[PDB]
Write a structure and sequence with these properties.
The PDB classes it as antibiotic. The entry lists the keywords Peptaibol, Membrane activity, Beta-bend ribbon spiral, Aminoisobutyric acid (Aib), structure from cyana 2.1, antibiotic, fungal protein. The assembly is monomeric. The entry is titled "NMR solution structure of Harzianin HK-VI in trifluoroethanol". The protein: Harzianin HK-VI. The protein is mainly α and 11 residues long. It is 45% helix and 0% strand. The longest helix has 5 residues. The protein starts with a helix and ends with a helix.
Length: 11
Amino acid sequence: ANIIAPLLAPX
């Protein structure tokens, strides 16, 4: 979930 957190901003 630490990778999706930041990847959420663009995606």
